[PDB]
Amino acid sequence: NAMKIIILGAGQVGGTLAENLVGENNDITIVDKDGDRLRELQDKYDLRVVNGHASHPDVLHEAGAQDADMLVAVTNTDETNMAACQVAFTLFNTPNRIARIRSPQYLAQKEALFKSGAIPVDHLIAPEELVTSYIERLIQYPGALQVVSFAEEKVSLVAVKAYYGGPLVGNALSALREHMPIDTRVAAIFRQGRPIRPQGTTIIEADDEVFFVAASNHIRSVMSELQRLEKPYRRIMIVGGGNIGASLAKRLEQTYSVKLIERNLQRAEKLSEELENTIVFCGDAADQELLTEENIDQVDVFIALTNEDETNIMSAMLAKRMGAKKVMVLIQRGAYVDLVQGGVIDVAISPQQATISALLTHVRRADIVNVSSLRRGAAEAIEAVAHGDESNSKVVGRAVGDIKLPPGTTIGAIVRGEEVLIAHDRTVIEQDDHVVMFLVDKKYVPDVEALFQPSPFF
Amino acid sequence: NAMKIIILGAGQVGGTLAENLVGENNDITIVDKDGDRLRELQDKYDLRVVNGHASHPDVLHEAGAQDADMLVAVTNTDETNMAACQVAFTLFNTPNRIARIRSPQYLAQKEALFKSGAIPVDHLIAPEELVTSYIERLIQYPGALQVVSFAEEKVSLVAVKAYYGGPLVGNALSALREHMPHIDTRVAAIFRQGRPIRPQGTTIIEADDEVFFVAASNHIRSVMSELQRLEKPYRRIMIVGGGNIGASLAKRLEQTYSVKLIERNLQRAEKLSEELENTIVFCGDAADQELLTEENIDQVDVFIALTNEDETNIMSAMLAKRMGAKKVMVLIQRGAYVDLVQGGVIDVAISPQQATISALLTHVRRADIVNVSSLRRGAAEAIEAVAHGDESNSKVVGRAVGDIKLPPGTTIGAIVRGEEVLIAHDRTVIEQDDHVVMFLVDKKYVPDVEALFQPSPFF
Ligand SMILES: [Cl-]
Ligand SMILES: [Cl-]
Ligand SMILES: [Cl-]
Ligand SMILES: [Cl-]
Ligand SMILES: [Cl-]
Ligand SMILES: [Cl-]
Ligand SMILES: [Cl-]
Ligand SMILES: [Cl-]
Ligand SMILES: [Cl-]
Ligand SMILES: [Cl-]
Ligand SMILES: [Cl-]
Ligand SMILES: [Cl-]
Ligand SMILES: [Cl-]
Ligand SMILES: [Cl-]
Numbered sequence: 001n002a003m004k005i006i007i008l009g010a011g012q013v014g015g016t017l018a019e020n021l022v023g024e025n026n027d028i029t030i031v032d033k034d035g036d037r038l039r040e041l042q043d044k045y046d047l048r049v050v051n052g053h054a055s056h057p058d059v060l061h062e063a064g065a066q067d068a069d070m071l072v073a074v075t076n077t078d079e080t081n082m083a084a085c086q087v088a089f090t091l092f093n094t095p096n097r098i099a100r101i102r103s104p105q106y107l108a109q110k111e112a113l114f115k116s117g118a119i120p121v122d123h124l125i126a127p128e129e130l131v132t133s134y135i136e137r138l139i140q141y142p143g144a145l146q147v148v149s150f151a152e153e154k155v156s157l158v159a160v161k162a163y164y165g166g167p168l169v170g171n172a173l174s175a176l177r178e179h180m181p182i183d184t185r186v187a188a189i190f191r192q193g194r195p196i197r198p199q200g201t202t203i204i205e206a207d208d209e210v211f212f213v214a215a216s217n218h219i220r221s222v223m224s225e226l227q228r229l230e231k232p233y234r235r236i237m238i239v240g241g242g243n244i245g246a247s248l249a250k251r252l253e254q255t256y257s258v259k260l261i262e263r264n265l266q267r268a269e270k271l272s273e274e275l276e277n278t279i280v281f282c283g284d285a286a287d288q289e290l291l292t293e294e295n296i297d298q299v300d301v302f303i304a305l306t307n308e309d310e311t312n313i314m315s316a317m318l319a320k321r322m323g324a325k326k327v328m329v330l331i332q333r334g335a336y337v338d339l340v341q342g343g344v345i346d347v348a349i350s351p352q353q354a355t356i357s358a359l360l361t362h363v364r365r366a367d368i369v370n371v372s373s374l375r376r377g378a379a380e381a382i383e384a385v386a387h388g389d390e391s392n393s394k395v396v397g398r399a400v401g402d403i404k405l406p407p408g409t410t411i412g413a414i415v416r417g418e419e420v421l422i423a424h425d426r427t428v429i430e431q432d433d434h435v436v437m438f439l440v441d442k443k444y445v446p447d448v449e450a451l452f453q454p455s456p457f458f
Numbered sequence: 459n460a461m462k463i464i465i466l467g468a469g470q471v472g473g474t475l476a477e478n479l480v481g482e483n484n485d486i487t488i489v490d491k492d493g494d495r496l497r498e499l500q501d502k503y504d505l506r507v508v509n510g511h512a513s514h515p516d517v518l519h520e521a522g523a524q525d526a527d528m529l530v531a532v533t534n535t536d537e538t539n540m541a542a543c544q545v546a547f548t549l550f551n552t553p554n555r556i557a558r559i560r561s562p563q564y565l566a567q568k569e570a571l572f573k574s575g576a577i578p579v580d581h582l583i584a585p586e587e588l589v590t591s592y593i594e595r596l597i598q599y600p601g602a603l604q605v606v607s608f609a610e611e612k613v614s615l616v617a618v619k620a621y622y623g624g625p626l627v628g629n630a631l632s633a634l635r636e637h638m639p640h641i642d643t644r645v646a647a648i649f650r651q652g653r654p655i656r657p658q659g660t661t662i663i664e665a666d667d668e669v670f671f672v673a674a675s676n677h678i679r680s681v682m683s684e685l686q687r688l689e690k691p692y693r694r695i696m697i698v699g700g701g702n703i704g705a706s707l708a709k710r711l712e713q714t715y716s717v718k719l720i721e722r723n724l725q726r727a728e729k730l731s732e733e734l735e736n737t738i739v740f741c742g743d744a745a746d747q748e749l750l751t752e753e754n755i756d757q758v759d760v761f762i763a764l765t766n767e768d769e770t771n772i773m774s775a776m777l778a779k780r781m782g783a784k785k786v787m788v789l790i791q792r793g794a795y796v797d798l799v800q801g802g803v804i805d806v807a808i809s810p811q812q813a814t815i816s817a818l819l820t821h822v823r824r825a826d827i828v829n830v831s832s833l834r835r836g837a838a839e840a841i842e843a844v845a846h847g848d849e850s851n852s853k854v855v856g857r858a859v860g861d862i863k864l865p866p867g868t869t870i871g872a873i874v875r876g877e878e879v880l881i882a883h884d885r886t887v888i889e890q891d892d893h894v895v896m897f898l899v900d901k902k903y904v905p906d907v908e909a910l911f912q913p914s915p916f917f
């Protein structure tokens with residue numbers, strides 16, 4: 001009865017996916033040619049390993065493709081991913097084939113190649129598109145440091161950083177709720193590298209990252225009633241004319257004043273040609289003389305998107321020191337995203353982290369829980385679906401205030417069809433509600449699953 | 459109208475294929491990510507290049523996939539070859555999609571993956587399987603040094619070496635022809651003392667000549683039979699190297715020959731010992747004098763060195779011949795090296811690039827595309843030409859071979875007329891759409907054969 005998932009590729013994405021999925025209700029097999037890496041994973045987690053080339057029939061067979069419920073293709077190459085989905089489909093009829101695709105040349109023919117059945121991938125996960133769209137999303141919500149997405153698209157969290165003199169600091173959460181009885185509440189707080197469970201007694205301090213629940217169509221409204229929506233950004237500076245930076249420039253250049261700095265001379269000329277309303281410089285990312293010549297002191301958002309984490313961090317730190325109001329950096333790993341952001345560096349984004357979020361939108365734990373895009377050390381936000389009527393459930397027909405939750409766990413909101421309800425103690429759960437929670441420690445996710453399990457499961 | 463061929467991959471096979479395919483009537487485009495190799499090839503041959511990843515849609519469009527007559531996928535990986543064929547099929551409807559596939563794991567499922575239409579590769583080229591079958595082919599033609607086919611397997615060519623006391627030495631070709639009066643064959647090429655010579659009626663065969671016979675594949679074995687080659691079959695075979703080729707070959711030979719196999723890796727040798735129930739399997743070095751002596755290397759009929767290292771193959775073959783193995787054969791990666799290696803102490807050298815190229819040429823020739831290939835040791839260049847046009851639109855159609863002015867050093871071996879194979883005579887009259895298989899001593903006249911056969915307006 002546990003769902004069977006095969007993950008092809010033991011890289012950072014494949015391994016982190018396995019970490020978030022393994023449990024009594026999801027059985028994991030991971031495939032790679034690096035035996036040292038497989039051994040490490042099998043020590044950490046309860047899963048099966050197969051050493052071999054991910055798209056070979058014998059390797060897929062040994063990994064259990066004939067009986068698997070999902071295949072996740074996150075190997076080194078787009079072509080091995082596509083081959084593996086094809087071979088698995090043809091020889092084993094494996095359902096739910098999902099692939100990471102990095103090459104924009106394939107993504108330009110999405111419909112013709114991947115929706116027609118020519119290459120039989122059910123879902124494509126395109127890291128560079130996800131990162132570009134995510135940065136654009138932050139830019140449209142001036143003042144926001146993070147927007148949290150769920151499988152259930154209609155609800156979001158938005159985070160703002162509390163500051164000396166700001167409208168949030170020094171207030172208890174219970175008092176917050178009485179000053180403004182807004183369609184929001186605090187879903188989570190992070191303070192000095194630690195998650196903080198929101199309580200009535202919780203007092204917001206300077207430098208807290210405070211996450212607010214909001215319907216996805218209501219983000220501006222909430223930020224505005226919180227007094228935390230800023231005026232639109234105007235001057236954007238991008239460092240790195242690679243795929244992400246060039247695509248971002250194109251999308252921003254008509255409404256913002258964009259400047260872009262590319263280190264490679266040949267690339268810089270091509271982009272100068274191609275980006276008609278962006279001013280392109282050939283120069284180094286962390287050149288003081290250039291940044292002052294280009295009025296870095298007036299930049300609203302400095303966005304460092306090179307291939308090198310170090311260059312991005314150092315150029316953003318410099319940009320911040322020189323008076324850019326906000327800085328954002330591309331970093332490879334999500335473990336590092338926790339470490340880098342929240343101080344001098346306003347926003348850190350990982351293509352790997354974005355890929356994992358998208359993958360988690362397509363796979364549920366126990367058919368109940370989707371893990372959201374907020375995952376920081378042990379803490380994360382999730383949503384859970386409440387299946388069954390009151391006689392087939394432990395939570396349907398109960399009030400939020402009577403539900404006994406695991407430690408460090410809070411319910412922030414409920415999605416009921418189309419409606420987003422902010423949770424209160426008297427809120428009664430209804431059949432097929434999606435319940436949004438924050439957990440300080442994800443080891444209690446299995447306890448959420450068990451709680452929401454309907455009778456027919458037993 | 460030019461035939462448009464896309465070669466995906468500027469590796470050794472792609473570059474060689476480009477050479478076999480030079481001609482006025484062939485417009486070649488090569489795709490690869492290595493700019494320097496593309497410039498190299500573009501300097502050397504008249505062809506177009508595209509710098510990019512071979513399975514990308516835009517790259518395929520830039521190479522002319524929407525209009526190509528053939529797509530040859532010989533990149534670095536199986537997975538790129540399979541993706542390129544699918545992409546070209548779906549977006550550009552490109553015909554004649556031919557792919558190299560090295561993994562036995564895909565080839566074990568060809569029917570399900572490829573022939574079903576799921577992965578739209580029209581023809582798989584499996585180098586390891588082709589090398590194994592080629593070696594087997596030589597073993598089943600004892601005395602043969604090369605076996606080639608032409609015209610969708612209707613014509614065959616076999617090289618033998620004339621020896622004192624045998625039926626060839628001291629006779630003229632005109633005489634030999636008539637000592638096999640019912641069996642139609644002719645000498646296509648001869649290699650004598652380091653050089654090709656033109657076979658003529660008056661040519662007298664000498665000891666140590668390599669002599670190439672051409673005949674219908676339906677009769678070629680009766681040719682070998684008349685040449686007394688089948689009177690002493692091989693009996694004792696020793697293989698060195700238990701990789702995919704060596705292990706497949708031992709499996710195929712072990713019930714009809716007495717086979718010993720030497721594999722260096724202990725784990726693999728244990729596996730093979732179990733798997734190959736009629737082969738004697740040793741774990742040892744390929745070039746160990748002591749082992750070879752214990753195992754009677756001096757009574758070995760054919761010693762076949764199939765390791766994954768060329769220098770080991772060469773060294774072990776040289777040592778075996780020195781120690782008295784009657785014939786030795788070596789696997790060599792690089793095609794150019796093959797002829798350097800063979801013809802003295804090493805009787806035959808085989809490469810997977812060569813086998814891959816021969817397979818590709820069967821498809822090229824079937825599609826009526828201008829083509830040349832070199833025989834063993836440069837004995838001749840081999841061309842299959844098509845006689846396009848009627849008598850007013852051709853320089854050859856309706857004329858007798860005897861009245862065609864062929865360039866120097868040229869021998870017409872066979873004509874293929876629908877299903878009929880005719881071993882050519884001066885009296886044979888060429889007909890429209892005949893395939894003519896010919897042999898040239900000097901490759902400089904290859905362009906002249908193309909000009910002789912091209913249809914009007916003769917250019
Ligand atoms: Cl295991
Ligand atoms: Cl504040
Ligand atoms: Cl909004
Ligand atoms: Cl990535
Ligand atoms: Cl993550
Ligand atoms: Cl549902
Ligand atoms: Cl060109
Ligand atoms: Cl299919
Ligand atoms: Cl003879
Ligand atoms: Cl003759
Ligand atoms: Cl002579
Ligand atoms: Cl025999
Ligand atoms: Cl020699
Ligand atoms: Cl005509």
